[PDB]
Design a binder for these strands. Structure first.
Length: 59
DNA sequence: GTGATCAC
DNA sequence: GTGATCAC
């Protein structure tokens, strides 16, 4: 699904930013919690990167 | 090792 | 076809 709320992330360029992820999803093996991942675009570079989402971010 | 995703 | 994202 696509994100709605902004997320506090560290961009690849090394800066803190508040970005809305274009896609969010859960990545987890059987039996374990795994992690929530967002796909973000660095507005400074236009480069795409992934980053952990807060555990309560809605998928 | 195992899980999903997609820009490259 | 995979880098890179994390937690357990």
């Amino acid at each position: 699904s696509s994100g709605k709320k902004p997320v506090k992330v560290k961009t690849p360029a090394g800066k803190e930013a508040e970005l809305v992820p274009e896609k969010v999803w859960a990545v987890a093996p059987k039996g374990r919690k795994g992690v929530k991942i967002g796909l973000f675009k660095d507005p400074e570079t236009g480069k795409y990167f992934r980053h952990k989402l807060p555990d309560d971010y809605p998928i």
